[PDB]
């Protein structure tokens, strides 16, 4: 699997899946991502993110 946020591979037997109001699903590899997301930041704008890379 891949982190629906930064884009790096999510080490199996790890991570969190958030379930949105509408029913959308967002797997996260770590709290770091989760938290950056809650800030309202987008993975694209974060240079450390595989996505942005």
Partner RNA sequence: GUGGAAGUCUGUUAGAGUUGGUGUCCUACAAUACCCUCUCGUGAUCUAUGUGUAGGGGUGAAAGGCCCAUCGAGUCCGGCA
Partner RNA sequence: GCGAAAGCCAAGGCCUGUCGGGAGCAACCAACGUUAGGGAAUUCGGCAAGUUAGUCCCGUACCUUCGGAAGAAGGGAUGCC
Partner RNA sequence: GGUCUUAAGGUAGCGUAGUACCUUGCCGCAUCAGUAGCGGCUUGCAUGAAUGGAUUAACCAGAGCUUCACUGUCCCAACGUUGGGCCCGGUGAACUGUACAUUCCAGUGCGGAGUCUGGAGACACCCAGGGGGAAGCGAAGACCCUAUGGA
Partner RNA sequence: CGAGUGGCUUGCUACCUCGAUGUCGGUUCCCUCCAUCCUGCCCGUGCAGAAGCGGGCAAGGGUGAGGUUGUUCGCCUAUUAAAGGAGGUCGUGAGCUGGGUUUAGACCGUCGUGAGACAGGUCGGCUGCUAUCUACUGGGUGUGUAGGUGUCUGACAAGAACGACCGUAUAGUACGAGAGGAACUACGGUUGGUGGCCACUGGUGUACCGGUUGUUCGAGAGAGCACGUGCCGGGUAGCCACGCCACACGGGGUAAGAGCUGAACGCAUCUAAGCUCGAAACCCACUUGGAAAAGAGACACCGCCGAGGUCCCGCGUACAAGACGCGGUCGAUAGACUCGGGGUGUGCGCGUCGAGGUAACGAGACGUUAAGCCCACGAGCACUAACAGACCAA
Point out the annotated binding site: 3, 6, 29, 33
Task: Name residues contacting Mg ion, limited to 12-51 (CB under 5 A).
Answer: 30
- What does 19 interact with, of RNA, Mg ion, another protein, none (CB < 5 to 8 A by kind)? another protein
Question: How many residues at the interface with another protein, by CB under 8 A?
Answer: 14
CB of 20 to Mg ion, least distance (A): 22
Q: Write the secondary structure of the chain as one string of H (helix), E (strand) and C (coil).
A: CECCCCCCECCCCCCEEEECCCCCEEEECCHHHHHHHHCCCCHHHCCCCCCCC
């Amino acid at each position: 699997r891949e982190c629906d946020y930064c884009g790096t591979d999510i080490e199996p037997g790890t991570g969190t899946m958030f379930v949105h109001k509408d029913g959308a699903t967002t797997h996260f590899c770590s709290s770091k991502c989760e938290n950056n997301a809650d800030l309202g930041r987008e993975a694209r704008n974060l240079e450390w993110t595989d996505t942005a890379r």
